Amino acid sequence: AKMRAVDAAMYVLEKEGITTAFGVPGAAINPFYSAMRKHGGIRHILARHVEGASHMAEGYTRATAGNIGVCLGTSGPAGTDMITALYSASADSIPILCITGQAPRARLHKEDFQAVDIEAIAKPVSKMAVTVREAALVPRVLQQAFHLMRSGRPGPVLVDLPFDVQVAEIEFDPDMYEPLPVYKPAASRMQIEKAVEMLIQAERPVIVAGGGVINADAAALLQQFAELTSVPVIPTLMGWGCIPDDHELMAGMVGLQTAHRYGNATLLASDMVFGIGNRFANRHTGSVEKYTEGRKIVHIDIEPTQIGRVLCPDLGIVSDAKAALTLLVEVAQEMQKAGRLPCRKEWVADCQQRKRTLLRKTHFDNVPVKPQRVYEEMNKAFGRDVCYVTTAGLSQIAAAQMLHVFKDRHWINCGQAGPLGWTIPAALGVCAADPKRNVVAISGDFDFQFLIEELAVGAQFNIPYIHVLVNNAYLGLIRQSQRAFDMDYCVQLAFENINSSEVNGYGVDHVKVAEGLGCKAIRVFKPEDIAPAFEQAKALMAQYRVPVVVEVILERVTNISMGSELDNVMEFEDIADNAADAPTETCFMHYE
Amino acid sequence: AKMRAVDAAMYVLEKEGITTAFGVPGAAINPFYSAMRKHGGIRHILARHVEGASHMAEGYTRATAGNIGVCLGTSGPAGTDMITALYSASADSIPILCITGQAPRARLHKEDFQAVDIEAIAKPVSKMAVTVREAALVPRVLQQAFHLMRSGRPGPVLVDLPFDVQVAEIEFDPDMYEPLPVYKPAASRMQIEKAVEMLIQAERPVIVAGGGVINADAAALLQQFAELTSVPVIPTLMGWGCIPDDHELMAGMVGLQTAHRYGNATLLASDMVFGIGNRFANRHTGSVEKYTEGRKIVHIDIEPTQIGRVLCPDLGIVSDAKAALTLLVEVAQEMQKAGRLPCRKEWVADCQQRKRTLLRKTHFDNVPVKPQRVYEEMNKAFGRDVCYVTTAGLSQIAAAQMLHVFKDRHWINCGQAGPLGWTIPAALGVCAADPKRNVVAISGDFDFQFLIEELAVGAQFNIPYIHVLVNNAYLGLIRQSQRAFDMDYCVQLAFENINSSEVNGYGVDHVKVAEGLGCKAIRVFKPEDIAPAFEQAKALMAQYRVPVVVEVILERVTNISMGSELDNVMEFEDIADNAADAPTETCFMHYE
Amino acid sequence: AKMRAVDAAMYVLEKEGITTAFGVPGAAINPFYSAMRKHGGIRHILARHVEGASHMAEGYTRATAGNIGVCLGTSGPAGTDMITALYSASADSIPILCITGQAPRARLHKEDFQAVDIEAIAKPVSKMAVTVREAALVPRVLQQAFHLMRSGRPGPVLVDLPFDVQVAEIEFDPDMYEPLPV
Ligand SMILES: Cc1cc2nc3c(=O)[nH]c(=O)nc-3n(C[C@H](O)[C@H](O)[C@H](O)COP(=O)(O)OP(=O)(O)OC[C@H]3O[C@@H](n4cnc5c(N)ncnc54)[C@H](O)[C@@H]3O)c2cc1C
Ligand SMILES: Cc1cc2nc3c(=O)[nH]c(=O)nc-3n(C[C@H](O)[C@H](O)[C@H](O)COP(=O)(O)OP(=O)(O)OC[C@H]3O[C@@H](n4cnc5c(N)ncnc54)[C@H](O)[C@@H]3O)c2cc1C
Ligand SMILES: COP(=O)(O)[C@](C)(O)c1sc(CCOP(=O)(O)OP(=O)(O)O)c(C)[n+]1Cc1cnc(C)nc1N
Ligand SMILES: COP(=O)(O)[C@](C)(O)c1sc(CCOP(=O)(O)OP(=O)(O)O)c(C)[n+]1Cc1cnc(C)nc1N
Ligand SMILES: *C1=C(C)C(=O)C(OC)=C(OC)C1=O
Ligand SMILES: *C1=C(C)C(=O)C(OC)=C(OC)C1=O
Ligand SMILES: COP(=O)(O)C(C)=O
Ligand SMILES: COP(=O)(O)C(C)=O
Ligand SMILES: [Mg+2]
Ligand SMILES: [Mg+2]
Ligand SMILES: [Mg+2]
Ligand SMILES: [Mg+2]
Ligand SMILES: [Mg+2]
Ligand SMILES: [Mg+2]
Ligand code: NA
Ligand code: NA
Ligand code: NA
Ligand code: NA
Asked: Half-sphere exposure of residue A136, counting CA atoms within 13 Å on the CB side?
């Protein structure tokens, strides 16, 4: 019967499916740590920055449907160090549960050491942020937290626990605890029949499959619906993987940066966008006037106030993507049996022809190394089960342009917020979620430096993955954005390293740093040494069971393809219309 | 006449005295960077984490009276990464100016890439947080920002700049720009005369000199007033340095952790606390009932709502500490000339006797090294002009117990928030403020890891200082706090480093990491090698002009003295009553 | 197909079962009153204090299970005059729907006559308080409002409508509108 509030909390977490937490203890959260030790059901991973714990939790969530990453911390600056992750999780409609210690209730207005109003700070980037005011409410707040994290548009929750609230005794019967029901609206048959009637009337439709499809665990249904209707599929960056890149209907990605020449050309040639669990992000659309010109728009979203937010759909449907796709498949089957689905061989052929011809060169023998070549080598070295984790920079943009993925939740990327430092901890979090996953991270040098210390978490806990580090001794994306201002200013990271003449003025020696943090590292200067470096990295991983960093020394300056509209993406580097120049496109290469 | 809003902003910053900024550019803040380049008056230092830039700005502010550290960043996660510094600056009543880029005004409700409501997030930890809605307001918001940062209780400001607002042209005449007046209330003669009458009637008074004395640039007046009245001075942690540690009236520090046995004993023996620019923090007082028992309390504070917040003073006076101390000196001089100031030889003698006898041992020859010995060696190796920078941990607590400082702004410490990672960037910020300052940082291993990458900022920009790193492969303070829970759980950082058997299972190899980041580093295992390591560090600094890390390998477990009340501080390690055991107390050693 | 956002709002209110509103018009909410007149399905009762309209809405809700009283007002002080009712409705776990007119979007930070941040004021005493920033979202915000007023612990909602948002044309098919599940 009688236990501390925090002891009750462990029973709640266990019943809600939690088996892992990432965190940094402190005096104010010690009662919770005490409870976690006595209960024994949760594996704790000690981060080397509270921000690191917060992004580990994000990776854990993103790795596997139903996962909820947990981030623990003390009072005061621990909560403030979780805001960037709450923002990133909110921004991408995924949940993490942050739990912070706090000063005792009676001391909250008294400027106690490390007492901050985390409720007010976190409110704008959470579905709920609450300082729990009574011991008996601790289980109830967690119970509601799980309901909110799973329901509607998913998002994160912060629970703030005054010390005295944590340690007070309550009566709690674990056998009587039950998770709450999850709220998800479902499209009616009438909605879905109208959508399919509209699709049947389009001559050149595409499905734009967003992150909501993955959130809903509906990848197989999305592919089934596309196959039944013979409609090309353009994943958003957040939908990437919900149909394999080598599927005959996968028509590429669209947008201003993380996009294909063939994807943009297909979108602009289409007469309908059938949007499922997407939200028409500005870096996907450019100007919405241009994106929607001559096109009917269908938009299916779980969140009513996402529909009409940035563009007006011809038909907007409020629905969970799995519920919607179940009915879309069933209606499509009825239409097929009635002979009412049109044959789309010519439009599909046209999309595949663009995908065959409108390429970018990757096969460069240049020294110093061209980044494009790294992505080619990654495609060749890893299997189709590879799981990529990345953030933002020319590193990530060119990666999204040139790598291939074949499974949902095998592109793990903070698409809306892009906080530098996210990559290392997020990757560790994916690995903790799934120790059999083949995780390969991609970072530029600056991203890799923000939370570089988190490599030692991988060393201490023996969490193996391969980290690809593409080093230009620059904030490369920011250099490129500064061309509009005719400058290159405060974006260089180069210096003569007094301990390493072998980095040739590139500044930080990432091999020495990674090795100091307990990991393994290989530096590559020549494009023909990339493939053997990847093979060696796999061997070192197997042998030592720690992260292995493969650092490629790039040319300082490479302008990656991008523009302000779909029809305006500038190609600075060589394009390609043949496989020899772009040999790892799925049309030319069998993956696995 | 006609220039961009951001060009006007550079003229405002110049006229407001800004010469330095710390930051990380991004597309949304590039117009401001463009303006900064064209204008040329501000030295920019590129951080390797936005959080790093934010704490550099804090160090810069703290180094020298009138300084205002500037932190620049892009939209979205850059602002969220500045919250911990806004909190820390607010918490300690010091200003930083954060400036963030933002999405264009028309796009603010549209989930543009990296658009976040930073105004709402930062409001709780700033004097003003504002998204500027018109180009013409940019100079006016900055003008008001400087007024608020300097006025009343100081604190930080965040200015958020939509891209379109930055680039729009306004008409601005730099010659017509004038900073606003600064609001500071001043005590009346009637207030100060009552305070001095009350002081004259005390038999055993102490002055508690807080951070407000330093904030007001009033250290010399504080010492003058103490000398005229012959009243012992107890600095708060945030007041430390406002009278030299070797002054005959400096009676030690008080509290639960960063405090002296003699300080606590003096406070408990006193019959009056004369508080000037302090606020009676809970780690200074313990229970206020015990702190105020048998004592009259005077409290002078610039902020009305600080007076009576945690304890009821017998006399509370709203005043700037410099204004107050000017009048306190003048009234004390009148009282002296009238023969009305009592002679306090016996009480002063009693305070000095406690300071002579109630010590803690530092002189340990143990291997592995006892942390206490490190502080002894630091006192001997550095001059009286040393400037210490630190955060929190057993590292910082024992430092505050055992190091000595002789000048105001030579203890630079985030006393109220204690965010791990603060030390490295804050130190770099102090160095940037004053290139002739002799900066010595103190970190535990965990603190040192949070923002370890910032060492490469020191390497790239050639910013020299000495960083003392006391390594126990533990969150030592948290281990010690967990004794109350009979556990040692999730607080160890040790592992067998696969690249360094010479760290003997301590985990991270800080010498390899520091050297990889472009700095110099020396590891010490034996107490007699500390002094020569400090001499070598000075030589390497002079030669290479980069940070030099001196890592001392400590015993894993040392319980530092601390308790829950002034009369309850537990001494786990050996105390001392003689100089041989504690040879660097000012009574026994001449500093410089 | 094409009608003003406020015309779409009338169809949403009809489909959500509204037949009655209590209110006080003003210039900023006149487009909504215009739409209510054209549509014809709602009996308006004109109060002699906005506070009076707001407590009429409360009484209407409380009278009969499923009822949701609607309170209409202009910008500025009309919304501030509804705060007491929002508080009372919240406090007793019952819904009212308050609709306020508002200055045009481009004028929201410009101290326009009677422009107030009613979103911030009403947030503490409502399940949702929102200034609608696009015409196409007007029907979706109302759709979400009815879900929130009926679901979980019931409580009130305030919807604040910039003038330009009210009058802008959108595509809206009344036949395809369905209330959300509770
Ligand atoms: C440097 C950089 C460049 C980029 N360039 C591009 C680019 O060129 N092209 C591009 O497309 N992206 C790009 N992105 C990513 C971009 O910012 C967005 O993150 C992305 O386009 C949004 O994907 P989405 O529309 O699928 O939205 P998501 O953020 O995945 O959300 C879509 C919708 O899912 C809904 N939802 C949630 N759960 C469910 C459910 N169960 N059922 C149904 N709906 C649900 C939500 O309500 C939401 O409205 C880039 C990112 C970076 C960092
Ligand atoms: C692990 C750890 C242990 C600690 N242990 C102790 C301890 O044992 N003892 C201890 O004392 N501290 C300790 N501290 C520090 C403690 O938390 C507080 O930061 C500190 O005691 C507050 O100092 P203060 O009262 O001078 O306040 P400050 O934060 O310096 O502010 C005092 C007042 O100055 C006022 N003010 C600002 N400008 C002016 C001006 N111009 N004129 C007049 N007033 C002005 C403000 O309004 C404020 O009320 C510890 C910190 C840490 C991290
Ligand atoms: C009194 O306990 P606390 O308030 O819990 C405190 C002082 O605040 C500290 S100190 C500390 C550990 C410091 O470890 P170090 O190796 O740096 O120091 P040490 O081993 O103690 O000499 C931690 C994790 N925290 C907690 C902490 C956690 N996360 C952040 C961001 N900042 C913190 N500062
Ligand atoms: C389109 O520009 P942006 O939005 O400004 C963007 C994508 O967001 C980026 S990417 C970037 C530089 C990345 O440098 P890397 O060396 O990691 O990569 P690269 O050199 O481009 O291959 C910076 C500083 N920021 C800005 C940035 C700054 N601070 C934080 C915390 N996160 C950021 N992500
Ligand atoms: C290349 C492309 C681009 C195709 O679309 C295709 O059909 C799916 C191929 O054959 C399978 C191909 O090799
Ligand atoms: C030791 C102590 C503690 C004193 O107080 C003192 O007087 C100021 C000394 O002599 C100067 C001393 O050496
Ligand atoms: C940090 O800015 P920099 O001085 O590095 C430049 C002038 O490019
Ligand atoms: C992170 O927690 P640990 O597993 O390290 C422990 C059991 O002490
Ligand atoms: Mg894959
Ligand atoms: Mg780079
Ligand atoms: Mg000194
Ligand atoms: Mg870091
Ligand atoms: Mg330690
Ligand atoms: Mg106006
Ligand atoms: Na492959
Ligand atoms: Na000295
Ligand atoms: Na009223
Ligand atoms: Na609310």
From this structure: 1
